[PDB]
Amino acid sequence: QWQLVESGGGLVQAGGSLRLSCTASGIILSINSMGWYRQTAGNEREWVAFSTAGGSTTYADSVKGRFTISRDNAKNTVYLQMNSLKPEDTAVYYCNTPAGRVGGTWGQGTPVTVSSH
Amino acid sequence: QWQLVESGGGLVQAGGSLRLSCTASGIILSINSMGWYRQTAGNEREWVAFSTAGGSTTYADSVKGRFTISRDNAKNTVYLQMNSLKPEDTAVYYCNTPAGRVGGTWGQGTPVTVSSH
Amino acid sequence: VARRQRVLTITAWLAVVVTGSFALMQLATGAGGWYIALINVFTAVTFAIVPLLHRFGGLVAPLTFIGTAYVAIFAIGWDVGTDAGAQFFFLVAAALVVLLVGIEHTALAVGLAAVAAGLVIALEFLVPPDTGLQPPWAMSVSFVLTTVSACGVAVATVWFALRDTARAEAVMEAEHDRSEALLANMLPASIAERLKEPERNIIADKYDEASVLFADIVGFTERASSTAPADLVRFLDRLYSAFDELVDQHGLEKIKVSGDSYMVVSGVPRPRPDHTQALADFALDMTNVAAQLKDPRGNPVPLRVGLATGPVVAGVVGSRRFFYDVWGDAVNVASRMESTDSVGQIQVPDEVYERLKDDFVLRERMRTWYLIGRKVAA
Amino acid sequence: VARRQRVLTITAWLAVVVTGSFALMQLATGAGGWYIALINVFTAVTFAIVPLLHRFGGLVAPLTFIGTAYVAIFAIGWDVGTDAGAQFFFLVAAALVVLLVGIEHTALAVGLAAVAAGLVIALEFLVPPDTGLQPPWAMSVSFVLTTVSACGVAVATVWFALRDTARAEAVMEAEHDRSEALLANMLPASIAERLKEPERNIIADKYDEASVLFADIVGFTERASSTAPADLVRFLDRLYSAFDELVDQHGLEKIKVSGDSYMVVSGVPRPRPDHTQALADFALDMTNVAAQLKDPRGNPVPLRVGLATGPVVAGVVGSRRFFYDVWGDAVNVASRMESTDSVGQIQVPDEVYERLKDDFVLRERMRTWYLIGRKVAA
Ligand SMILES: CNc1ccccc1C(=O)O[C@H]1[C@@H](O)[C@H](n2cnc3c(=O)[nH]c(N)nc32)O[C@@H]1COP(=O)(O)OP(=O)(O)OP(=O)(O)O
Ligand SMILES: CNc1ccccc1C(=O)O[C@H]1[C@@H](O)[C@H](n2cnc3c(=O)[nH]c(N)nc32)O[C@@H]1COP(=O)(O)OP(=O)(O)OP(=O)(O)O
Ligand SMILES: [Mn+2]
Ligand SMILES: [Mn+2]
């Protein structure tokens, strides 16, 4: 079963911090890239972070400097540090490889909400 | 002697009208294009009018609608009607084919001055 | 003609507000007399007319409005006492006129201001002070209303002018920002500044090391024979959009897309020690993505991929229709490799094999070596 | 932050001018007394200080300047008579404050204006009229100076603000115009509007007839072997600049320039009945120009030219690095012809021969027919 499950989302206030986790079964992460996308509703799902096999990382302009993507090869996991959160980042975050991205085969994602409560 | 001689220039007032003549010896005009350029000094010589073999004509943006290029095949000549003249058009006007243009081989041109006297 | 429209809008609203103010004074007045009423009708009618007749021509109309204002106000002030408040309106108008008229006529505007001042020094002296026409208490109420109106007219007109300016600025900024975004998209920022400058200089940049990847489709003509051209262009657009997303997502740069051919270049804008490794990983990901995708026919779309490395030259060429471009021996090498590559395979020369063997798997078959993939072990 | 700078500049110049005005009143005064002098020193010092202390933070500083102005003017007006002219300065300030403060605080600004008015109605009544302190004639001169200063301060400040706005607008316009000119140069205008729109739609345009010309260099690699790359790029730029001038001068459009290859397309943006004839004439002129030109080696540069005609498809492709492009069978035909063309010759197929024989000369040698030139007779 080639699957990816996300976790770590929840409720926070503006300016808080989160760590989203993505664990995949059915592939080897060392030889595959990874990317974190976010979906709000006003658009279809856009890529905010990307980590290649080899350590290179890239981020979207709206999110550079606040979010950090890292890997844990033994656990077969990818982690997204989120800092200095803003209301614009409230979304459902997803994790994939490019093949799954263009094939449309995803998991259920993880919700992240930025508001005061 | 492949030569082109220009004529018809002189002194006029703003808003006047001129007809510059270009007669060439050594080629057949029906099978060769023709172009009228102007030189002021603030730039090197720029093309203001062009007539192809076949009747197609084109003009520069700064001069479209005021200047008209025509041919007279029996006389082996090209004529430039100039209308609604302005101080910006004071220059030395030259006539050539593209080959002579890129080869640097020209005649002496014809002077045109726009001012009140 | 935006400045002219701003001036005309502010003067029209000014006329409307002043007529509105004058009507209240006229209605409130009781037992004041008819001699003043005759002048009042003339003033109100002319003030209402001038906005409707603004298009006669030239700057004479706004000046005529001010001439009428000055004459009417002087005439009303002379008869009534000084305490009514004719002085205050002159001071408002002195500051207001400069804003009303454009910069080109500032000198004239200044004169008008002086003229107003010339009247004020006279108005206190020449005019008979405290002349009483019918009820004085209405005169005191007139003073209060004069103060309030003098403040309000200026406040409203200045705010309206500032609002119009801000609106124009916002529209300007949005319109410019869209074009700037497009230009930034379709060329690198650093070279864009060079292109913008009026001075023309040939752009040539020498780069010691770089790597180039060429990808092409196989049997595209056969696919074209059985499909409508319009659908074929759409298929190409879909494929290249996916590839462009992957390229941006790896960080590499793509110079151009000519028909079936797709060209990628690594490290030209900024050199890096590990350009070749990144290019190889990108090529593997590209092959996987291309394999997954499906065409309208339903047959898989194979891609031939050839990689090369070496020094390169970058810069635009020509005097029209510019685009970044790249040049060097590596381009010739890559073109040859891609041309001779087998279906669904990636090929590289011996020189690239010298670099990539350490961190990548190259096997089988100038002599070349197929690029199978990355090392599983880590 | 341009708006903030505008506000700060106008307030600083306002402070300077008001201090300059106040100094003259202080120097002119004779035998006025010391009680007023004590207040005058305080007012002048605070007015001079506030511009130097403008960077403490927030909008409280410009409001403090106005608080000081109001307090000082009220204090001086109370002691002296009403005829001095304290009333006029309030009216100037009422209109001036709205301009001084930004739009975001307009409501507050309005309140300030009302406050000024609230004082004026009081100032005439509450203040003791015609209170005489030492010489009255100096008081009358003070009234005259008050009128002149009240006019001049407003005139100067308004003109300065308008000047700053016009300067900003001019710089804005030049900066935007340069980018717009570049964008217009590097793509047709009609498609640029489509590209600018946020909504993304695939651009496909079907054209019934068009003609394409391909030109290429022969033995470019051999020339490259004996020349430095940097000089080679310069030579290419010179050649393509000349060709671009000729193309613009005939009116045809060029889509792109890939290395040695030069591509021209006729009639795509606007159909015409005589596209093929124009393309043939342009090709003849291009061959002559290329023959005349000289390369660094000194050897002539031959060019292989192939022409084709047929329906085409136009539009951009991809999601990044857009350019106009063209597609169709005619492109394949032209590429094949150009590839198989002999050195220093122009080749066309039978179909083009069907059209061009009437007005052009085609001779010798799917079957093709060399394009020798135009008919001498007319
Ligand atoms: C009916 N033909 C088409 C209809 C719609 C869209 C495209 C085409 C088409 O024919 O595309 C071909 C060229 O026009 C188009 N093309 C080639 N050069 C150009 C070019 O320079 N400009 C444009 N706009 N299109 C070009 O590429 C495509 C493939 O030609 P190649 O020379 O690359 O060879 P191949 O068929 O892929 O086989 P192989 O190389 O694997 O052996
Ligand atoms: C040492 N090589 C160069 C140094 C400086 C500038 C250019 C070159 C150079 O090699 O240019 C060649 C390609 O890089 C360059 N080139 C080809 N494709 C591309 C391309 O896709 N992009 C860029 N930037 N350059 C390209 O074209 C040029 C000629 O290659 P062709 O495939 O067109 O064949 P040919 O040598 O002209 O002979 P023939 O076609 O008449 O039989
Ligand atoms: Mn191809
Ligand atoms: Mn070539």
Residue numbers in the entry:
A (entry chain C), B (entry chain D): 6 to 122
C (entry chain B), D (entry chain A): 41 to 405, 416 to 428
Tell me what the authors wrote about this structure, in their words.
We reconstituted a complex of the detergent-purified full-length Cya and NB4 (mixed at a molar ratio of 1:1.5), in the presence of 0.5 mM MANT-GTP (a non-cyclizable nucleotide-derived AC inhibitor), and 5 mM MnCl2. This resulted in a 3D reconstruction at 3.57 Å resolution, which allowed us to reliably trace the polypeptide chain in the cryo-EM density map, covering residues 41–428 of the full-length Cya construct. Our 3D reconstruction revealed the previously unresolved portion of the protein, the 6-TM bundle, arranged into a homodimer. The two nucleotide-binding sites of Cya are occupied with the molecules of MANT-GTP/Mn2+, which we modelled based on the previous structures and the X-ray structure of SOL–NB4 complex. The C1 and C2 maps provide no clear evidence of asymmetry in the active site, which we have observed in the structure of M. intracellulare Cya. The TM helices 4, 5, and 6 of Cya form an extensive dimer interface within the membrane. A negatively charged cleft (site Ex1) is formed at the extracellular interface of the two 6-TM bundles.
Mycobacterium tuberculosis adenylyl cyclase (AC) Rv1625c/Cya is an evolutionary ancestor of the mammalian membrane ACs and a model system for studies of their structure and function. Adenylyl cyclases (ACs) convert molecules of ATP into 3,5-cyclic AMP (cAMP), a universal second messenger and a master regulator of cellular homeostasis. The protein has to dimerize to form a functional unit that has been previously presumed to resemble the pseudo-heterodimeric fold of the full-length mammalian ACs.
